[PDB]
């Protein structure tokens, strides 16, 4: 997150970190046993880390739980990044409370102008690189279809949307992928890709979670 702020400890209680000896992606808790993240963060040997703040220090409210299943979308394309979504099953259910909590799925899509909350332990610099200890936050609006399409000619499918600042200075970045985009209390987006971090006229591009609700529900029910 470039141009964001320190969230505060456990103020984003559905924020997970994905860990295999180190932090490599984020994700969102959607119930006590399942996490949404990016298909492009698929790997083996994933540990889910819940109610983290400082990811380098044990501080008190962490639950470390191994993934027992990672289900990348069947129609995921690595070249286009279309259908960039993955479901992770926890080996055992998380204990849920105020500092570890699931985030609701959308019941409809959100519109252009809506403010959203994007979080993560990704890089904080737009040129050069710098990774934080504690969780970072950013308030950013959804952009019109046309402005998104006009920012990235031919790359925006119907399962993507942009959010951010056309002027630069404020964006998600490397390390934030898999992470949540929360708008009026719903998980609408997933940190996916963009052209640099915080570049003028290159806002971020997020997996449009409202198109996957039924899939998510049915995948969960059958696994």
């Amino acid at each position: 997150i470039v141009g964001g702020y320190t969230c505060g400890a456990n103020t984003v209680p559905y924020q997970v970190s994905l860990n295999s000896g180190y932090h490599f992606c984020g994700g969102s808790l959607i119930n006590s046993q399942w996490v949404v993240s990016a298909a492009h963060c698929y790997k083996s040997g994933i540990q889910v880390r819940l109610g983290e703040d400082n990811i380098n220090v044990v501080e008190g409210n962490e639950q470390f739980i191994s993934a027992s299943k990672s289900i990348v979308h069947p129609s995921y394309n690595s070249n286009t990044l279309n259908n960039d979504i993955m479901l992770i099953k926890l080996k055992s259910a998380a204990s849920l409370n105020s500092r570890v909590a699931s985030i609701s799925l959308p019941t409809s899509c959100a519109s252009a102008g809506t403010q959203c909350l994007i979080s993560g332990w990704g890089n904080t610099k737009s040129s050069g690189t710098s990774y934080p200890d504690v969780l970072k936050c950013l308030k950013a609006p959804i952009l019109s279809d046309s402005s998104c399409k006009s920012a990235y000619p031919g790359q925006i499918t119907s399962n993507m949307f942009c959010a951010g600042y056309l002027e630069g200075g404020k964006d998600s970045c490397q390390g934030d992928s898999g992470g949540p985009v929360v708008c009026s209390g719903k998980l609408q987006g997933i940190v996916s890709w963009g052209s640099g971090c915080a570049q003028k006229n290159k806002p971020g591009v997020y997996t449009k979670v409202c198109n996957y609700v039924s899939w998510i529900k049915q995948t969960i029910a059958s696994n």
């Binding site: 070249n79 998600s172 992928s177 890709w193 971020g204």
Partner: peptide, 21 residues
Amino acid sequence: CKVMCYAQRSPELLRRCLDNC
């Protein structure tokens, strides 16, 4: 391909993607 690898939000996953192109 590689430019899109860089677009995904140097780490190993990027390097893999990079190698894979």
